[PDB]
Amino acid sequence: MNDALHIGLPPFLVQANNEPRVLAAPEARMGYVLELVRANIAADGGPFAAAVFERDSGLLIAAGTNRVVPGRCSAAHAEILALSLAQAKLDTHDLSADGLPACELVTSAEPCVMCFGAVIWSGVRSLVCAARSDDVEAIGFDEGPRPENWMGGLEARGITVTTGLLRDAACALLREYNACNGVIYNARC
Amino acid sequence: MNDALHIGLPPFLVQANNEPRVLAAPEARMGYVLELVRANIAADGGPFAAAVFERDSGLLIAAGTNRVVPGRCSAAHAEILALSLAQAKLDTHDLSADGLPACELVTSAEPCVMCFGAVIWSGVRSLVCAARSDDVEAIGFDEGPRPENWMGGLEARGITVTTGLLRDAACALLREYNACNGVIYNARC
Ligand SMILES: Nc1nc(O)c2[nH]nnc2n1
Numbered sequence: 001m002n003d004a005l006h007i008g009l010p011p012f013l014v015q016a017n018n019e020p021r022v023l024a025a026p027e028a029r030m031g032y033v034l035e036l037v038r039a040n041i042a043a044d045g046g047p048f049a050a051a052v053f054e055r056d057s058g059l060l061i062a063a064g065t066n067r068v069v070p071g072r073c074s075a076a077h078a079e080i081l082a083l084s085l086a087q088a089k090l091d092t093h094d095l096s097a098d099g100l101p102a103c104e105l106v107t108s109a110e111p112c113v114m115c116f117g118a119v120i121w122s123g124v125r126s127l128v129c130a131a132r133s134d135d136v137e138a139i140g141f142d143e144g145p146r147p148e149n150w151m152g153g154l155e156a157r158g159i160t161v162t163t164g165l166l167r168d169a170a171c172a173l174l175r176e177y178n179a180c181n182g183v184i185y186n187a188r189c
Numbered sequence: 190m191n192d193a194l195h196i197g198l199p200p201f202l203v204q205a206n207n208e209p210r211v212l213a214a215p216e217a218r219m220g221y222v223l224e225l226v227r228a229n230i231a232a233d234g235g236p237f238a239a240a241v242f243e244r245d246s247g248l249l250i251a252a253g254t255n256r257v258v259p260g261r262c263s264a265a266h267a268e269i270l271a272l273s274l275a276q277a278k279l280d281t282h283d284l285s286a287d288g289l290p291a292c293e294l295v296t297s298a299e300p301c302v303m304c305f306g307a308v309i310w311s312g313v314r315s316l317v318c319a320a321r322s323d324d325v326e327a328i329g330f331d332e333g334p335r336p337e338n339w340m341g342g343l344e345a346r347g348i349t350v351t352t353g354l355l356r357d358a359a360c361a362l363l364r365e366y367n368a369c370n371g372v373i374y375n376a377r378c
């Protein structure tokens with residue numbers, strides 16, 4: 001594009017960002033995200049998906065997936081898209097804006113150093129991860145050089161962190177992605 | 190969009206991305222980048238700008254500026270837009286892809302933790318900064334929790350790093366923004 005940075009979304013994702021969806025339980029939220037991982041893999045993307053939910057009600061605000069290769073954009077990680085699309089939807093660059101319900105980013109895998117920073121500047125007050133960093137590195141994806149004890153860095157900034165949620169289900173999807181090739185392989189790898 | 194990730198670019202930035210331009214000297218490259226910083230401030234954006242140049246020829250590939258507030262996107266840092274717009278233009282998520290010239294990211298200030306990762310994933314082989322992280326955090330801009338010796342971290346990834354280029358002018362622009370960042374109206378601003 002000439003007058004804008006435009007990252008298009010595939011059909012399943014456009015739908016995911018425009019379909020009403022309230023998922024109370026944390027496992028319900030993560031389960032849905034893993035559904036997005038599968039759909040994204042079939043849509044030429046990396047094995048990564050994430051979604052911003054209102055922390056308490058579980059109302060889905062926005063979802064993103066790895067679109068690095070098909071989108072010719074190394075910054076197009078699931079977290080970046082999810083956080084940015086949620087901000088556009090709520091009409092603010094700051095999800096912690098006064099009067100705004102607390103937001104939570106539910107992600108299929110622990111964040112790379114890039115998305116680590118993205119979470120910090122986003123305004124989200126919670127981060128829930130499925131697959132661990134080691135799980136991701138085991139299929140060729142780099143997390144990059146994150147600071148020492150990144151989880152503590154987030155908590156120290158008001159962002160609670162949960163890991164390992166439905167990890168096994170996520171790994172099955174990571175192992176399947178690796179087994180069946182990949183393509184130019186996403187970013188952070 | 191209310192579906193795709195869309196960050197609009199202000200006229201001056203479109204202009205910059207539209208007109209072929211070659212800047213051989215580092216000072217020339219940074220000088221142009223600092224011109225974008227001032228233009229961006231005048232266009233309701235943050236005091237930051239960056240541009241991707243072909244390292245060995247000086248050809249400008251793409252430029253970006255902080256459009257966080259106007260863009261309703263916390264991930265819209267100079268570096269992110271510059272790197273992404275360069276990739277969209279060359280039609281690839283890897284700036285070091287076979288066939289492409291070695292790229293260089295010239296930025297008005299040392300990268301925050303988010304952009305730190307973006308640089309690594311981008312494919313650029315060189316990073317050139319003006320203002321130091323202390324100058325930026327001096328006017329209240331957080332760089333975030335970068336890993337220890339992030340500069341060495343980059344060099345170990347094969348990305349050469351230079352900093353302090355035209356630091357004085359960069360710093361003056363930062364202070365200029367700060368002096369005018371308040372609610373009480375000042376005709377001189
Ligand atoms: N580490 C890593 N790599 C990718 O390519 C990703 N896409 N989305 N999240 C991602 N995380």
Ligand SMILES: Nc1nc(O)c2[nH]nnc2n1
Nearest residue numbers: 237255266267301331332
């Ligand atoms: N630290 C920091 N803060 C911002 O707002 C930026 N925009 N672009 N680069 C930026 N870097």
Ligand SMILES: [Zn+2]
Nearest residue numbers: 077112114115
């Ligand atoms: Zn990431």
Ligand SMILES: [Zn+2]
Nearest residue numbers: 266301303304
């Ligand atoms: Zn940044």
